[PDB]
Enzyme design. Structure first.
Site, PDB file in Angstrom:
ATOM      1  N   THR A 259      14.668 -53.849  44.590  1.00 20.12           N
ATOM      2  CA  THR A 259      13.387 -53.311  45.025  1.00 20.12           C
ATOM      3  C   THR A 259      12.464 -54.441  45.412  1.00 20.12           C
ATOM      4  O   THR A 259      11.833 -54.412  46.469  1.00 20.12           O
ATOM      5  CB  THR A 259      12.737 -52.499  43.916  1.00 20.12           C
ATOM      6  OG1 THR A 259      12.706 -53.305  42.731  1.00 20.12           O
ATOM      7  CG2 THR A 259      13.507 -51.238  43.643  1.00 20.12           C
ATOM      8  N   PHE A 384       5.640 -47.063  43.407  1.00 24.53           N
ATOM      9  CA  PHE A 384       6.020 -47.360  42.034  1.00 24.53           C
ATOM     10  C   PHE A 384       6.123 -46.116  41.185  1.00 24.53           C
ATOM     11  O   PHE A 384       6.014 -46.190  39.957  1.00 24.53           O
ATOM     12  CB  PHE A 384       5.032 -48.350  41.440  1.00 24.53           C
ATOM     13  CG  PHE A 384       5.096 -49.685  42.114  1.00 24.53           C
ATOM     14  CD1 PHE A 384       6.159 -50.520  41.891  1.00 24.53           C
ATOM     15  CD2 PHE A 384       4.099 -50.073  42.990  1.00 24.53           C
ATOM     16  CE1 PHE A 384       6.233 -51.754  42.501  1.00 24.53           C
ATOM     17  CE2 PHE A 384       4.177 -51.297  43.629  1.00 24.53           C
ATOM     18  CZ  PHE A 384       5.235 -52.143  43.374  1.00 24.53           C
ATOM     19  N   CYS A 391       6.599 -47.238  37.676  1.00 25.29           N
ATOM     20  CA  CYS A 391       7.278 -48.498  37.520  1.00 25.29           C
ATOM     21  C   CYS A 391       6.595 -49.341  36.453  1.00 25.29           C
ATOM     22  O   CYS A 391       5.443 -49.732  36.618  1.00 25.29           O
ATOM     23  CB  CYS A 391       7.261 -49.234  38.845  1.00 25.29           C
ATOM     24  SG  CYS A 391       8.006 -50.828  38.667  1.00 25.29           S
TER      25      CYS A 391
HETATM   26  C1  HEM Z   1       8.558 -53.755  44.667  1.00 28.29           C
HETATM   27  C2  HEM Z   1       9.338 -53.669  43.594  1.00 28.29           C
HETATM   28  C3  HEM Z   1       9.581 -52.365  42.806  1.00 28.29           C
HETATM   29  C4  HEM Z   1       9.504 -51.093  43.186  1.00 28.29           C
HETATM   30  C5  HEM Z   1       9.175 -50.531  44.579  1.00 28.29           C
HETATM   31  C6  HEM Z   1       9.843 -50.268  42.055  1.00 28.29           C
HETATM   32  C7  HEM Z   1       9.885 -48.910  42.053  1.00 28.29           C
HETATM   33  C8  HEM Z   1       9.969 -48.093  40.954  1.00 28.29           C
HETATM   34  C9  HEM Z   1       9.845 -46.659  40.966  1.00 28.29           C
HETATM   35  C10 HEM Z   1       9.580 -45.794  42.213  1.00 28.29           C
HETATM   36  C11 HEM Z   1      10.020 -46.228  39.716  1.00 28.29           C
HETATM   37  C12 HEM Z   1       9.972 -44.774  39.261  1.00 28.29           C
HETATM   38  C13 HEM Z   1      11.455 -44.362  39.264  1.00 28.29           C
HETATM   39  C14 HEM Z   1      11.558 -42.906  38.913  1.00 28.29           C
HETATM   40  O1  HEM Z   1      10.514 -42.235  38.784  1.00 28.29           O
HETATM   41  O2  HEM Z   1      12.704 -42.398  38.764  1.00 28.29           O
HETATM   42  C15 HEM Z   1      10.249 -47.377  38.870  1.00 28.29           C
HETATM   43  C16 HEM Z   1      10.465 -47.354  37.534  1.00 28.29           C
HETATM   44  C17 HEM Z   1      10.800 -48.447  36.811  1.00 28.29           C
HETATM   45  N1  HEM Z   1      10.811 -49.732  37.271  1.00 28.29           N
HETATM   46 FE1  HEM Z   1      10.322 -50.385  39.106  1.00 28.29          FE
HETATM   47  N2  HEM Z   1      10.112 -51.091  41.002  1.00 28.29           N
HETATM   48  C18 HEM Z   1       9.935 -52.378  41.424  1.00 28.29           C
HETATM   49  C19 HEM Z   1      10.108 -53.496  40.660  1.00 28.29           C
HETATM   50  C20 HEM Z   1      10.466 -53.459  39.350  1.00 28.29           C
HETATM   51  C21 HEM Z   1      10.627 -54.611  38.473  1.00 28.29           C
HETATM   52  C22 HEM Z   1      10.439 -56.089  38.912  1.00 28.29           C
HETATM   53  C23 HEM Z   1      10.969 -54.137  37.269  1.00 28.29           C
HETATM   54  C24 HEM Z   1      11.282 -54.885  35.952  1.00 28.29           C
HETATM   55  C25 HEM Z   1      11.254 -56.210  35.811  1.00 28.29           C
HETATM   56  C26 HEM Z   1      11.014 -52.695  37.350  1.00 28.29           C
HETATM   57  C27 HEM Z   1      11.340 -51.887  36.294  1.00 28.29           C
HETATM   58  C28 HEM Z   1      11.207 -50.536  36.245  1.00 28.29           C
HETATM   59  C29 HEM Z   1      11.437 -49.713  35.075  1.00 28.29           C
HETATM   60  C30 HEM Z   1      11.928 -50.237  33.713  1.00 28.29           C
HETATM   61  C31 HEM Z   1      11.205 -48.456  35.431  1.00 28.29           C
HETATM   62  C32 HEM Z   1      11.289 -47.209  34.548  1.00 28.29           C
HETATM   63  C33 HEM Z   1       9.881 -47.011  34.024  1.00 28.29           C
HETATM   64  C34 HEM Z   1       9.889 -45.872  33.055  1.00 28.29           C
HETATM   65  O3  HEM Z   1      10.289 -44.762  33.445  1.00 28.29           O
HETATM   66  O4  HEM Z   1       9.508 -46.094  31.896  1.00 28.29           O
HETATM   67  N3  HEM Z   1      10.712 -52.322  38.624  1.00 28.29           N
HETATM   68  N4  HEM Z   1      10.215 -48.488  39.664  1.00 28.29           N
END
Ligand code: HEM
Ligand code: HEM
Lengths: 446, 447
Positions: A259, A384, A391
């Site tokens: 991502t 996010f 996120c």
């Molecule tokens: C531009 C970069 C990123 C984008 C666009 C992005 C996007 C997203 C999105 C859309 C979700 C929601 C997913 C869902 O609802 O099923 C999510 C959840 C999550 N993301 Fe990101 N992400 C990015 C970077 C990161 C990074 C760098 C990390 C960790 C170092 C990360 C860790 C997580 C985690 C652990 C979740 C689950 C959160 C939860 O439900 O508690 N993401 N991300």
């Protein structure tokens, strides 16, 4: 009332529509044809793809909709386990890890990751400084080296050393192959399963070993692993167990690496495709990043770079969808009755092209759209995700992307030397495949 | 190590610094100059004003610091008695009332106050619907009419009928004058004031005691706090609140809740009319969510952005702008400020809420989106409702009221900052935008 549905394939319903190498782009085109909502049926699966801010703002009502594990996430759950991204909100380990990890992903926590981010960012800059003339940069390839290594370093103080490699670290190969196998399972194999289990074992063994090593050595680092080994959920008083810590680490790598690298790659893509925007971003980077090494505070000052990143996320949100289920019977948009458990997919790139929100020039790359977050309607911009399931790495991703983009813009002039034609490769994430640039150093030391 | 201290006045030390009509804002300016902590001395009084989340998160460690009665609260205690806000945590009546009242102030309990909140809110909306063209709204005045009456109705099923009056109900006049006298004593021929103060105390006690006695005599059950306090038994002691303490609780609800909440509403509307994009977003949500002539409890909970607006108004101008703590034992604050047992701390909330290390450089900007995801707020960065077990018991009440009312306002009117109002924050024990006036053009949506 009646909900559009794209063409069906008899018993297979809509599933073969995803048997294409660009399913998000396929779904976007369907949304172009069918509008803000369409039913999408597969064997044993019904979902509804939402594309309008009008409906998605309701889908983001957490009192009415909770995060659903999409089929993608369900398959990723086979190796991300009950890590944050692949757990249901009601799973004890979700709330536990969420409570524990939230402080370590805060904007304030970025101050503590900054030095490690800079470490990898400098490696990227030095790599590009060391290219010979008429050599070019494979942008998503280098961005991914950068984000994998940054998450490895900030996540568990582990150096994948991707910039020392043509062949990624075996864990990365296993993780990428596991993601590919998860992604391949959506569109459709005995070898694949043995490969899948082997890749899970590679991921588990490395991460479990690093956790065991860290527990054995007792060493404290500025990394997420240390926070997770020491963290206690305020609610339960319990720490994450080692298996969940492993799943979190794997999750950070899965959720964060592609991502964020996709974000950087798209940002640079849009920048080189929009020289005036690039010039403005570069001017900001030069004005702000006055030290050889960016400080955390300087990164926060890269406002236009931040808007650049948001605008890249607007056009190509690199985690392009998330799934919700109706917590109770509810009516969507006043005309789509949903039963309890009914699934929604938020088609983020389509949401982000809602002309009623962004105006007619939705396809134009104009970071200025993000000058004022208050001018943006609620839930118009969801790169996010949403709510408590948003996120957790958002500040991390944005900090890293701003830092890296800022340094890139400080240190190099970029040439779209191939007049690169945007070709968005789809895995579970999006990236501009084959995006290549030439970077003429501005010869600014580090 | 060495702690900054603002300019002194000889024997009076720092006290004359509070002899200004905007002392919180003066203290904020001092904190701007001196930083996260400064000593503040008055005759027979030493306190330390904390302004950084770094120090305030330690002061909010309840194992190390307990609520202290500030001099303001000590003065308010002369008429709020051992009500919840002016009692020490170790006082029997604090824990007793806390245990009894906590369930009646929960988010769930707001379902039972909602209808009476709507009653006063509708009166406010109707008042504004009935303004003639080019008449304007005195916002804090109407907000205060609204919160007093709501607390009156939800508190003890008593109608101050503030929207029927230019001169408030005598109880309110005495209460406001008692609060004013309490506030004026902080800044200090005071013999008339003392007789007036006692007169106002008697007015307040008499009405509230009469209402309590009336209620016990009639046995009538209402959806008000008074009924809950008449029926409540503290699980720990097994005791009910006695009538005197119930009176002090009722007085406390009015003191603690009416101007804080009205100030919140007034500031929120101020920031809304100063930030048209925010107003449109809030108004859009209010229009989308409040689909019925009368908002339901559930609809108010959906006013998420209105809630963010309110939190962001609370961030900038927390209307109960300080609370006081004392060190339970010898302890070191922030690794460099040794505190002896009993040493007092003041948490300067508006400064805390401007801690750039928490909120970024744009602390002065009104951006409700800061609160879009409550997970983004660090622990103890945002303390408009105080801390721990001594936090505002009325928080859910205040926010439900403020959300409901703001939502109805945004549903029913377009607001014009027709004077281009220049923010002027009047300070009593609370903060309000003095002279804030708007014109409200009805959207002509029936009730
Ligand atoms: C531009 C970069 C990123 C984008 C666009 C992005 C996007 C997203 C999105 C859309 C979700 C929601 C997913 C869902 O609802 O099923 C999510 C959840 C999550 N993301 Fe990101 N992400 C990015 C970077 C990161 C990074 C760098 C990390 C960790 C170092 C990360 C860790 C997580 C985690 C652990 C979740 C689950 C959160 C939860 O439900 O508690 N993401 N991300
Ligand atoms: C936005 C509106 C309000 C704000 C900003 C606010 C703020 C506060 C703060 C900061 C405290 C802690 C004071 C201290 O530590 O010395 C407090 C306590 C208290 N507030 Fe509120 N308040 C509000 C509304 C209300 C309402 C509506 C009520 C009652 C209906 C209420 C009743 C109380 C009580 C009883 C306490 C003492 C709690 C205890 O110590 O047990 N407040 N408030």
């Amino acid at each position: 009332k009646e909900m559009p549905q794209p063409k069906t394939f008899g018993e297979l319903k809509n599933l073969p529509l995803l048997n294409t190498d660009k399913p998000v782009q396929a779904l976007m085109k369907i949304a172009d044809e069918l509008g803000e909502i369409f039913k999408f049926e597969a064997p044993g699966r019904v979902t509804r793809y939402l594309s309008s801010q009008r409906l998605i703002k309701e889908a983001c009502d957490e009192s009415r909709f909770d995060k659903n594990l999409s089929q993608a996430l369900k398959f990723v759950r086979d190796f991300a386990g009950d890590g944050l991204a692949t757990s249901w909100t009601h799973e004890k380990n979700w709330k536990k890890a969420h409570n524990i990890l939230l402080p370590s992903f805060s904007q304030q926590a970025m101050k503590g990751y900054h030095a490690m981010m800079v470490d990898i960012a400098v490696q990227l800059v030095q790599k590009w400084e060391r290219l010979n003339a008429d050599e070019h940069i494979e942008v998503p390839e280098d961005m991914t080296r950068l984000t994998l290594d940054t998450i490895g370093l900030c996540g568990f103080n582990y150096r994948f050393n991707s910039f020392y490699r043509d062949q990624p670290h075996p864990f990365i190969t296993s993780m990428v192959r596991a993601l590919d196998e998860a992604m391949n399972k959506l569109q459709r194999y005995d070898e694949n399963k043995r490969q899948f289990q082997e890749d899970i074992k590679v991921m588990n063994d490395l991460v479990d070993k690093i956790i065991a090593d860290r527990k054995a050595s007792g060493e404290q680092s500025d990394d997420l692993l240390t926070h997770m080994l020491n963290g206690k959920d305020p609610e339960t008083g319990e720490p994450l167990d080692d298996e969940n810590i492993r799943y979190q680490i794997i999750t950070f790598l899965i959720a964060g690496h592609e991502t964020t690298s996709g974000l950087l790659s798209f940002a640079l893509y849009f920048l080189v495709k929009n020289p005036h925007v690039l010039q403005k971003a570069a001017e900001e980077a030069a004005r702000v990043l006055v030290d050889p090494v960016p400080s955390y505070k300087q990164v926060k000052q890269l406002k236009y770079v931040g808007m650049v990143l948001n605008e890249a996320l607007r056009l190509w949100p690199t985690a392009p969808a998330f799934s919700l289920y109706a917590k109770e019977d509810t009516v969507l948009g006043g005309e789509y009755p949903l039963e309890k458990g009914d699934e929604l997919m938020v088609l983020i790139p389509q949401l982000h092209r809602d002309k009623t929100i962004w105006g007619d020039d939705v396809e134009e790359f104009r970071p200025e759209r993000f000058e004022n977050p208050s001018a943006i309607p609620q839930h118009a911009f969801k790169p996010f995700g949403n709510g408590q399931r948003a996120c957790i790495g958002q500040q991390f991703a944005l900090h890293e992307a701003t830092l890296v983009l800022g340094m890139m813009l400080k240190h190099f002039d970029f040439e779209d030397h191939t007049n690169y034609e945007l070709d968005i490769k789809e895995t579970l994430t999006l990236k501009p495949e084959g995006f290549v640039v030439k970077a003429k150093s501005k010869k600014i030391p580090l």
